[PDB]
Design a protein around this ligand. Sequence first.
Ligand SMILES: O=C(c1ccccc1Nc1cccc(C(F)(F)F)c1)N(O)CC[C@@H](c1ccc(Cl)c(Cl)c1)P(=O)(O)O
Lengths: 365, 379
Amino acid sequence: GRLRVVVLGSTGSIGTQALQVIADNPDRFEVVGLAAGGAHLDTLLRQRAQTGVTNIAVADEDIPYHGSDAATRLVEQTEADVVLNALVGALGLRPTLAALKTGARLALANKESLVAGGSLVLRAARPGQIVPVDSEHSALAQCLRGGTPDEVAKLVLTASGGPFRGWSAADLEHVTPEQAGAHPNTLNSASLVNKGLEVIETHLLFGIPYDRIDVVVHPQSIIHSMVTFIDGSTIAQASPPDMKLPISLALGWPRRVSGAAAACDFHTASSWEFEPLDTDVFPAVELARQAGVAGGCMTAVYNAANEEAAAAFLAGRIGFPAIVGIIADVLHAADQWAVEPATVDDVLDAQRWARERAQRAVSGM
Amino acid sequence: GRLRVVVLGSTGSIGTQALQVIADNPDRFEVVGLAAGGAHLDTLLRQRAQTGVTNIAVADEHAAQRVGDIPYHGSDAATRLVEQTEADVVLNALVGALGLRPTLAALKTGARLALANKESLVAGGSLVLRAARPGQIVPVDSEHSALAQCLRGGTPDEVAKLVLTASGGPFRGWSAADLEHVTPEQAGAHPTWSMGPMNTLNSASLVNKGLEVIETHLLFGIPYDRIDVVVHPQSIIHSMVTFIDGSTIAQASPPDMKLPISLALGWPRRVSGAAAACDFHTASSWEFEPLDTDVFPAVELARQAGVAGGCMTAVYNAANEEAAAAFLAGRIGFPAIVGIIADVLHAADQWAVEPATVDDVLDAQRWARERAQRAVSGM
Ligand SMILES: O=C(c1ccccc1Nc1cccc(C(F)(F)F)c1)N(O)CC[C@@H](c1ccc(Cl)c(Cl)c1)P(=O)(O)O
């Protein structure tokens, strides 16, 4: 019994680390499909040559699946046990629903499909079929083996805090892309939107109310999240930052993969720091809670407004603090959007509306 | 689903705290028995009055002329209480030698054993393990309780390492030369007729960690070479397990014995509101440093004793008590405590055999003490 794995977004960081794990564990896994956004052409051909897999999709015109929904066609067609969806942003919602319709495990890295899809994605899924790839949700799943659902008091997500811990909003006005770790996932870390995306994700996957989902800043990124139980016990998960750990566990769930990552080393001194998030300077998480509480298409809106505002920062059209400022403005104008999505088109409509309202805000800021 | 609980050693700190948990949770727990040594009769008597529990035992032969009306009293009376009382959980918080036979009787009834008595595992470990079903024993101390919670994070073949944490004691960071002439008072030990000064000293010498390592091997069936100790001055994380994939799971809580007590009583179910949670609203730091094993050889020495097996950890602990008492009395220097344990272990080949009965554990302890007395007497 080898598990058959489709890797979507194979040429990115998650994708390539996923292939390394499969290659180290040929007894446990087998690659049977790949899909890539064509920008890293050279890597895909290398992966075809190395894995021998010809069953390949390319999202940008020997390839059996070329097009714009190339990855979606591949998923529907290929006999698989696990689909790893590491596609970035919006190009990943349709492949997620396709993946879930096949009945295969969805190892989800592309948290945007879930944040935007909301209930639409949940209705497609059976229990235990969506298995998170990010480190925080991997941690939580691990820690929740520490009890039953009614023993849970709080889920506690850790946030690196980005490069701007201690910065005031005034300090933030003069921030460039490279200081926020970008160039004209990493930006979302700097602005705390990633955490907001993760609060929503946490709610959708585990069923926990927003008011029992905390965020604490932990700059060493060694504790990946924690669970506090009703007795006052907290269970935490810890490891040096290395995506192959939660990638490995997502593919082999419920079984751990030996040697996937280096453990923490307690033979040299270290220090794990905690501090409260500055909610005045970084309100992305509170804003996510608002959108999640409103529900429906509002989380699609939260995310789409982000992608657009962030794109505007990365082109130099807006200042850094305006990214989360615009999400705020867009959300507060989105009273028509707390409706449950009936189809993909509804989600697609929410996103278009959010993009355009963001562009409008840009064209004033 | 009301669990019936027998609380042995009911008048010390663990017993008094267990009873408070039970009084706060009457729909989950029912006290059905109490026992305490005759030195603590008056307190035991108040507990009868307060709980309404008349099934009580004086666990030794003491206060004999005052135990008119008590249903069980005398040597091994706590054992008889345990044999004769229908219960779901026995909490054994008796101290020392007194704890062992009641542990064995508890396991024989089929009840869950919430175990606080160090003697049971350290000295009578093989007797105790032989008597138990898998999962029948649930530890009550912080560290082992942490470890039991953390092992929920995988199947047994996925466990790479268990990691006990340690405050490091008052002598954390001290060099060998600095510790040569420290006094009992500098270890933080001051005269009192209890195990308190001994407990404090064990924490300064790292013998306490040694014992916990032994206990870890017995409780969880993990080899001594996969049991680590790390220094963690804050004592917020109580222990961790590292799995074969590189993931570590840790348990963290402000120090409060009600937490592991509640868990040991209710296992596998948690008890709402037992203790305060960690608060992440104020900034904090959790630090780790390696144990200095050159200066603190007591931990590796406990592994040597554990690997030898049988009554060997009975020997380690009994030799400890003797040498430590001698340091307390000002008769030997601080480094000589672990030196004397090692000298006694080196002579103790005959005690590696598995004990057939409690009497063999007792013979091992008697041999160890006399051997340690001899060594003390010649410095
Ligand atoms: O699982 C992870 C993760 C954790 C530690 C380190 C890296 C992580 N993933 C990651 C980070 C950057 C880039 C990528 C990738 F390129 F997609 F692979 C993945 N996340 O979900 C990333 C959130 C966090 C994170 C942590 C550290 C850094 Cl350096 C970054 Cl950029 C993001 P946060 O929201 O700021 O806490």
